Amino acid sequence: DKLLSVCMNSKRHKDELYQECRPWEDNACCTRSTSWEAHLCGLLTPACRKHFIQAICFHECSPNLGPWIQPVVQRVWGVPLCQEDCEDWWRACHSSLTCKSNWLHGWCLPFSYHFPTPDDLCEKIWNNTFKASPERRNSGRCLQKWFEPTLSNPNVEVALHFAHHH
């Protein structure tokens, strides 16, 4: 689509957002009901679910997903996530357990078993919707799953970097 920032054309995707999806308020690819609805084996930790919902706000609401868009026959394949992202993800969800490794969401063994390494979690989840990046959060070569809404968005310049250099 137009400019540098483009949203994948689909049903789920095209000032007031709910909880973890707030960081993208200034530019977002997801409508309010998408965030609100995004917040809707065994009891899962508050941190683990926090991380999942964060990932959903990222997939739906982020303008920066352009470069990795691949067609279904839209879909996103292997957006690099920073080491700390998948790390805190896999550690928060470590204690928790899960039944199946498909983990199809929107489309009872421990998590560590299905995903021994954070690479396993971020890669195997959603058929490689994310890539496990060796680059740490601050380098600028990897996308940040979540950021505090007040601060500037680190992922813009990265989406440009991958849109041109890669």
Numbering used by the authors: 21 to 34, 41 to 66, 79 to 111, 118 to 151, 166 to 224
Text lifted from the article:
A decade-long search for a protein pair mediating this event in mammals culminated in the identification of the glycosylphosphatidylinositol (GPI)-anchored glycoprotein Juno as the egg plasma membrane receptor of sperm Izumo1 1, 2. The Juno–Izumo1 interaction was shown to be essential for fertilization since mice lacking either gene exhibit sex-specific sterility, making these proteins promising non-hormonal contraceptive targets 1, 3. Whereas FR homologues are found in all vertebrate classes, Juno appears restricted to mammals. Together with this observation, our studies suggest that the molecular basis of mammalian gamete recognition evolved from an ancestral FR that lost the ability to bind vitamin B9, but gained the ability to recognize Izumo1.
The bulk of the structure, including four core α-helices and seven disulfide bonds, can be superimposed onto the ligand-bound form of human FRα and FRβ with root mean square deviations (RMSD) of 1.4 Å and 1.6 Å over 166 and 167 residues, respectively. Although glycosylation at N73 is important for secretion of Juno (lane 1), there is no electron density for the loop carrying the corresponding GlcNAc, suggesting that this conserved carbohydrate affects protein solubility rather than folding. Despite their overall similarity, there are striking local differences between the structure of Juno and that of FRs and RfBP. Whereas in the latter proteins three highly ordered loops generate a deep binding pocket for the respective ligands 4, 5, 6, the corresponding regions of Juno are either largely disordered (loops 1 and 3) or adopt a very different conformation (loop 2). Taken together with sequence alignments, these observations suggest that — in addition to key amino acid substitutions such as D103A 1, 4 — structural disorder or displacement of conserved pocket residues important for ligand recognition in FRα contribute to the inability of Juno to bind vitamin B9.
